[PDB]
Structures are given as C-alpha cells and as structure tokens.
Design a protein that fits this description.
This is part of a larger assembly, with one copy of chain A (about 375 residues) and two copies of chain B (about 170 residues).
Chain A: E1 7-10, E2 16-19, E3 28-30, E4 34-37, E5 52-53, H1 56-59, E6 64-67, E7 70-71, E8 74-75, H2 78-93, E9 102-106, H3 112-124, E10 130-135, H4 136-143, E11 148-149, E12 151-154, E13 159-161, E14 164-165, E15 168-169, E16 175-177, H5 182-195, H6 207-215, H7 222-231, H8 252-261, H9 273-283, H10 289-294, E17 296-299, H11 308-319, E18 328-329, H12 337-344, H13 351-354, E19 356-357, H14 358-364, H15 368-372
Parallel strand pairs in A: 1-9, 9-10, 12-17, 17-18
Antiparallel strand pairs in A: 1-2, 2-3, 4-5, 4-6, 7-8, 10-19, 11-14, 12-13, 13-16, 14-15
Chain B: H1 10-20, H2 26-29, E1 33-40, E2 47-56, H3 58-62, H4 67-73, E3 81-86, E4 90-91, E5 94-95, E6 99-104, H5 111-119, H6 121-126, E7 133-137, H7 140-144, H8 146-153
Parallel strand pairs in B: 6-7
Antiparallel strand pairs in B: 1-2, 1-3, 3-6, 4-5
Classes of the chains: A alpha+beta (about 375), B alpha+beta (about 170).
Chain lengths: ~375, ~170, ~170
C-alpha cells in the first residue's frame, strides 16, 4: 500500500491471473475469452454492445464468437488483449494502475516484434509509470534457488520445456507442446462422456474444472492399475455436482493424466511429453547432463495432481541410460510458483534501480527493452 | 413489461466513484463505499442514490466489524431498495472483491413502492450494462445468511466469508 | 527477473582478503578463512559478510579436523545463506585450492528469506565477475557428501578429498 505494490499480470492461452507484491500467490484468476456476435446474434434486436472478457462471457459463448487474444503463449490480436488489461485492473483487481506498476509475463522465445509493441501500449494506452517483462520458466527454476537446470512448466494454457543455464534459456533445447491445463479439462469431460454421462453444451464444460483439481490422480504404474479398476471395489471416488448428483469416477482417476504421457489414447501419433523433455536433454551438452537430472523442477497449472511426482521418477528412470542419480525438485507452492517468482522481487528498493520507466521509453523509444536486459 | 425506469445520471456518478475507488491516502481508503443504497425518488421518474443510507469499508476498522449485518438492519422488508455491495471476501490464497448488485425486493413490502421496483429490474440493470453477479432476497433470513453470499463464490473453496463467519 | 541485489562493498572487502591471503607469519596462516558465510542483511537492500559464522583453515590443526562438516552443521536448511569455501583437496601429485562459491538454497527454508536469495543468485555472482566453479545443494545430504565436492574435480583422479574421506 503506497510505495509501488507492483501489479503482476500473468498471461497465457487461458486461465490468466494477477495480484500484488509480498503475496504468496495471485489474488485473482480469470478465463481468457472475448466475445462478439455469432450466427447473427441468435434472434430479435441485434447490434448492442458485445466484447465480453472474463467468465461472464463463458455463459454467453453460444451467442458470442470467442477469439483467443493469446494463442499458445503469444498474442496475435491486440484489440482483444487490450480489453483484458482494462477489465483486469478496473474490474478484476479493482486497483488503479496509476499508483501500482505492472509486470507482464512472457512465453519462452517470445518474438521480437511483439516485445517492442507490448511495451508501447503500456506507456501510451494506460500511462503506467513502470513495467517489466519476465519468463515463467526462468522464475520457476529461480524460485527453487537453483540457476542451473531444466524446467518442465505446466502452464495454465500452454506447456513449455525451457532448460536454463545462468539465466539464459537454451534455444536449441526448447520445444512447444500444446497440452497443458485448459485442454486437459476438455479431455476429462470427453472421457467422462464415454462411460455414460451427458455433456453436450459448452455451459457445463466449466463444471469439470472443479473436478480436475479434486479428482485428478496419477497411478504408480498404469497397466497394473487398469486390472485393479475392472473389479471396482474402492476405486470409485465421490464428487459434488451443483445440482446434487454425484458422478462417480473409478478408472478415470489415473487415465486422464496419462494422456500427457501416452498421447495415443487421444489419437495422436506424437511422443509423450515426458519423453519430449528427454529429447531436450539428449541435445544438451553431455558433461552437464548429470547435473540437469538433479536440477529438474515441476511447476504450474496442472502439476498439482497427486501421484504425478511418483510417476515422473519411474518414466525418467526407464528413459535414462542408468547407473546415475535422478532427483526431482518439489516446491510446496508449485501451482503458484510462476506467479510467485514475479511477485516478490518487484518492490524491495534495489529493484527501483532496475525498473524500465515511462520516462525512459519517451527518450530512446521501442529500442530500450532490448538494451537494458543483461 | 420491459424497462420501468430510464436513468437520472445520479447512479452512474456514484457507481463511477466505486469503479475507480477515488482513493490514494489512508484517510480516504477507509471512506470508500463497501455498500451503497439506491432507490427511485418520488414519482419514480428518476433513479438515484440515497444520501442517508450507505456502508463504508472504513467502518470495519473504525467501529463496526460486520458491515454485512448493518446492511441487514438498514434494509427492512418494509422498504424496497436497490443496492451495490462489494464482496470483500477471502478465498484460501488472499482476498479480492466481486462487484455485486444486491436486489432487495421483499414481497411483504408496501405494494405501491415495491411494485415499481420489481418491474424496474431490467431497467435498472439496463444502465448497469450487464452485471457480473447478483444476490436477491425478499426476506431478512436470506439477506442475513452468510451462505447466500458464499453461494456466488462456489462454497467449496472458501473458509472465511469475512475472515470469521464460515 | 534479473538481479535482485546491487552490492554493499562488504563482500568485496572480505573476498579481497581471501584472494591475496593477507598472511605471512605462521600465526596468520592458520587464521586464513577456509570458508566464509555471506548473507543479505535485513531489508535485503545490502549484501554483507556474517561476523558470527565463518570457517578457518587453522581449525584443522587447532582443534577441528573436518572443516567440511562444521559447514554442514552451521548451514541448516532452516536458513538460506551464501558462502565461499576453499577446496583445499589433494589430486595424486600434491594439493592446490579451487575458489568455489557455495550456494545454500534449501527449498524447505523459510520462504520469505529464501525467495530473495534464490532470485539474487545472478546479482550475487554479478559482483563475483564470473566464478570458476560452484556447488549448490538444497539439503543436508548433498552438502554433507564428499562426492559432490569431488564431482567438480572430475572424480577419476582424486584419492583423498581431505586426505582421508575418499
């Protein structure tokens, strides 16, 4: 309150979030959707005001066309993006941007054209006194107190692999995978439907999100687990629906997370994501490979499914040559680790020296962001 | 029916104040309006803000620790009024604020005033340009209860509506 | 993030002392600092040296024969600290000394202090002007183990980390 609390806006494909410095997690989380007339608006009196940002738009999905301001970690349409920032400060955070400086997150290997322009909008469109751009993968490795290693980041909307050595990400070790958090929620509903439950409208899609944090589990061994499931017994697990019925989930408890590990269930011929992390290591320098195994960090969106840590150890051991130690770094606050890293180092006093200010932008121009980082 | 009232500029003026907070110093953070009462003035031609009745966030620190109770006291089923209240609640990480319009439309209230109010909800929210969430009760028990405010939230991830009642 | 702390001149002063040894007579060779503990003082504005906690090479002769153990004892995962330690190890010809910065960044340490420490590694080594080799562990077992110190060396040509453990 007063000095410059630091407003942090975290952007991704979906499930964006924001808060204040000194916090242990972000204050508010909202959906990333924008809607305007679709199918002529659905009948009787069309024209009105339509550009809805937030979860109010989710209900309105049938009558409004949704466009993604962010496609898999990048921004293609700026008009949609501006509405999100307006709505976040004025309606979601309910704090004036003018008193508090804003920090914006970025996807790894973010294109250069976008980087100069986002800075440009903050200074003239919202007149923000200070802002900074950070990488979600860098902060997560940073949070554990380790600068050398490889981080598998489960984003709220997109999953990126970004090995980090001395603050520098490896361009030749980074790959983009599109399954992260929101996509799994779609998937969970899809398999739930197969057993015998009715899902035909986008309105009830949101309901399975609640299901995801409470009921997503990872099995120690998938095939052995499948045999246990057929008998049922204690496998079935209770869940709460707003109406009152409880949808029982038995062998779906472990199978859902498995899609990341085993894409074949989806219908994809693509290699599993854990394997994908392994390819990055193979490409990496041989001498530091042993260090990388002891430097692995799990953070973000859907990594919080219980039993996931146990599964990771097993697959990596099978994938790895052998004869060596594999260690996984597990921070208690892994779900909020991406946001948490950004929040704390934004108000100390010596971070004042380092801020990119509005006044500086006016002088040098767009070129300034490239010049002061490292 | 469609929209009983057209707007008198008064509601927008007070609503605008809440939207930007209109605060900087410690002196006016506590003078911010947690809740505001809206009603339609006589003849019901115009919709305005009631000077006499309002709730301040500063009150929790100043002298009253339960703003959401004072509201219950000053909202008889005997009178039908329109209100804006800030959620100001904690969900297991920290706390934010949801803008909610509180509709007080008691069935038992004097029919003459209440009937225009009931018919005017489309008109009143028409100027609200669609509002996020709403709470509506026609009796003291629904307005009094912690759970109704918590229902909006979801209720399975909220241990403390005001940091103590739940 | 980039560099959480800017420097308070204290670290450079103590580091400089280690670099030249600041010793001649037998009296001060044993008072040379095998290991020094560095931390950031309250408010974390400045980085300094801790007066209370340090390790001397003279200790091995004076009374403690395992400096690399005392360090393990005085570095709880409970507190997150920065440290400089001299390798002082034998490789089958004789022994030299590698300057290594020891990063103690336990995940389990109090979050408030630890988080600034974690974010400050680029800033702390920024004043280190690039450091030769480093050892980092977030738990007692990695700090305790002889092998981690030996890993830096190579490990296939070192029979005696301290002249006895390996």
């Amino acid at each position: 309150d007063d000095d410059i609390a630091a407003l942090v806006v975290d952007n991704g494909s979906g499930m964006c979030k924001a808060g204040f410095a000194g916090d242990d997690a972000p204050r508010a989380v909202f959906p990333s959707i924008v809607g305007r007339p679709r199918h002529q608006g659905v009948m009787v009196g069309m024209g009105q005001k339509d550009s809805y940002v937030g979860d109010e738009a989710q209900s309105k999905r049938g009558i409004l066309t949704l466009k993604y301001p962010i496609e898999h970690g990048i921004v293609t349409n700026w008009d949609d993006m501006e509405k999100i920032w307006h709505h976040t400060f004025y309606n979601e955070l309910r704090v004036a941007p003018e008193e508090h400086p804003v920090l914006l997150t970025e996807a790894p290997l973010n294109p250069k054209a976008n980087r100069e322009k986002m800075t440009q909008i903050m200074f003239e469109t919202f007149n923000t006194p200070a802002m900074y751009v950070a990488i979600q993968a860098v902060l997560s490795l940073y949070a554990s107190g380790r600068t050398t290693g490889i981080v598998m980041d489960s984003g709220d909307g997109v999953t990126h692999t970004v090995p980090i050595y001395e603050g520098y990400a490896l361009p030749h070790a980074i790959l983009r995978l599109d399954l992260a958090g929101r996509d799994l929620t779609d998937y969970l509903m899809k398999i739930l439907t197969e057993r015998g439950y009715s899902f035909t409208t986008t309105a009830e899609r949101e309901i399975v999100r609640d299901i995801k944090e409470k009921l997503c589990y990872v099995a120690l061994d998938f095939e052995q687990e499948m045999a246990t499931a057929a008998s049922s017994s204690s496998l079935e697990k209770s869940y709460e629906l707003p109406d009152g019925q409880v949808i029982t989930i038995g062998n779906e408890r472990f199978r859902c997370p498995e899609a990341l590990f085993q894409p074949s269930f989806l219908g994809m011929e693509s290699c599993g994501i854990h394997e994908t992390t392994f390819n990055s290591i193979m490409k990496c320098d041989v001498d530091i490979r042993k260090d990388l195994y002891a430097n692995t960090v799990l953070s973000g969106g859907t990594t919080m499914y219980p039993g996931i840590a146990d599964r990771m150890q097993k697959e990596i051991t099978a994938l790895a040559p052998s004869t060596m130690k594999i260690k996984i770094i597990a921070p208690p606050e892994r779900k909020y680790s991406v946001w948490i890293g950004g929040s704390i180092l934004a108000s100390l006093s010596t971070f004042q020296q380092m801020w990119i200010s509005k006044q500086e932008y006016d002088e040098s121009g767009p070129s300034i962001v490239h010049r002061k980082c490292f | 029916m469609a929209s009983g009232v057209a707007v008198s500029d008064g509601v927008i003026k007070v609503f605008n104040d809440m939207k930007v907070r209109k605060s900087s110093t410690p002196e006016e953070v506590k003078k911010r309006k947690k809740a505001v009462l809206f009603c339609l003035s006589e003849d019901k031609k115009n919709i305005i803000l009631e000077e006499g009745k309002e709730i301040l966030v500063g009150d929790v620190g100043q002298t009253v620790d339960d703003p959401y109770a004072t509201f219950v006291k000053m909202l008889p089923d005997k009178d039908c009024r329109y209100a804006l209240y800030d959620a100001t609640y904690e969900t297991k990480e920290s706390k934010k604020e949801d803008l909610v319009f509180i509709f007080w439309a008691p069935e038992s209230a004097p029919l003459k005033s209440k009937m225009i109010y009931a018919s005017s909800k489309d008109a009143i929210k028409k100027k609200l340009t669609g509002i996020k969430h709403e709470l509506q009760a026609n009796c003291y028990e629904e307005v009094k209860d912690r759970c109704t405010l918590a229902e909006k939230l979801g209720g399975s991830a909220v241990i403390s509506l005001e940091g103590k009642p739940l």
